[PDB]
Design a protein around this ligand. Structure first.
Ligand SMILES: Nc1ncnc2c1ncn2[C@@H]1O[C@H](COP(=O)(O)OP(=O)(O)OP(O)(O)=S)[C@@H](O)[C@H]1O
Length: 272
């Protein structure tokens, strides 16, 4: 009775998301549930339930707010759901697939905003773990909105690994994961929004994971026109294989992006 369901907004590997009107507060919300076609798959059911139960609820202008989670009583049975802030907009994946690479200054602005979201999250003890173009939206009013924060999982499907294009080397190898993993993955996103391509592609996730662990990324400026060596230095630092060589924090990464936006040399090691 509280929510008046509107149009479906989108879907991913696991979930479908619908527009709803909250009639108590008179606000639009987005309601996320298991994809109807995957709802009786054990692997997807278990994953969705755990991610709804452990959904990151953060209050920051560049993070999609989670308002409520639970299991709604329905005739068909208990329905796991997430109610969150509605974003009128599109994902970075949509933008890349529809409009192509962003201009460098815009890309820097978007990823700088993403760094602020991640720093806030990191400050409150939360690692994202699944930074990728599909998990960052840009609103109709050009606001950056990071979403779908991941959760800690058991140490050794359900669409957890797709292409592996955005996983960090530590995630691929089952090593300890910290905020520097988000830096790496955010680096992969930055690479893709600048060039139109992620740094590594392959016929399988195994092939891509291999490249993340073993193969140096081609500098962005060698893949797309209109870029600079100073932007190369920032991207390649975020993508260092050893976390010891990366930006140690999201604020550190943001600081270098801001420098490049302002035409100042970054502190990242120079690349020739
Ligand atoms: N807060 C939101 N506001 C508007 N649209 C949203 C919102 N959240 C999700 N969507 C749309 O629904 C799509 C899927 O949402 P996700 O949360 O990324 O789905 P998912 O299937 O659980 O995730 P993966 O990463 O694909 S497995 C997004 O790409 C958006 O198009």
């Amino acid at each position: 009775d509280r929510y008046e369901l509107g149009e479906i907004l989108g879907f991913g590997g696991m979930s479908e998301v619908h527009l709803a009107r909250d009639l108590r507060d008179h606000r639009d919300v987005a309601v996320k549930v298991l994809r109807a076609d995957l709802a009786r798959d054990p692997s997807f059911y278990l994953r969705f339930r755990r991610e709804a139960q452990n959904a990151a609820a953060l209050n920051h202008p560049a993070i999609v707010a989670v308002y409520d989670t639970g299991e709604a009583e329905t005739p068909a049975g208990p329905l796991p759901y997430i109610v969150m802030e509605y974003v009128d907009g599109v994902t970075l994946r949509d933008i890349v697939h529809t409009e192509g690479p962003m201009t460098p200054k815009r890309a820097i602005e978007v990823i700088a905003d993403a760094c602020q979201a991640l720093n806030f999250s990191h400050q409150n003890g939360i690692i994202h773990r699944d930074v990728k173009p599909a998990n960052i939206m840009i609103s109709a009013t050009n606001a950056v909105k990071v979403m779908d924060f991941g959760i800690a999982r058991a140490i050794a499907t359900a669409a957890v690994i797709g292409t592996a294009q955005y996983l960090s080397p530590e995630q691929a190898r089952g090593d300890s994961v910290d905020a520097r993993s988000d830096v790496y993955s955010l680096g992969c996103v930055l690479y893709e929004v600048l060039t139109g391509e992620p740094p590594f592609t392959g016929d399988s996730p195994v092939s891509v994971a291999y490249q993340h662990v073993r193969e140096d990324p081609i500098p962005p400026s060698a893949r797309h026109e209109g870029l600079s060596a100073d932007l190369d230095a920032v991207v390649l630092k975020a993508l260092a294989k050893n976390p010891e060589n990366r930006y140690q924090t999201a604020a550190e990464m943001r600081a270098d992006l801001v420098r490049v936006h302002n035409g100042e040399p970054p502190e990242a090691p120079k690349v020739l």
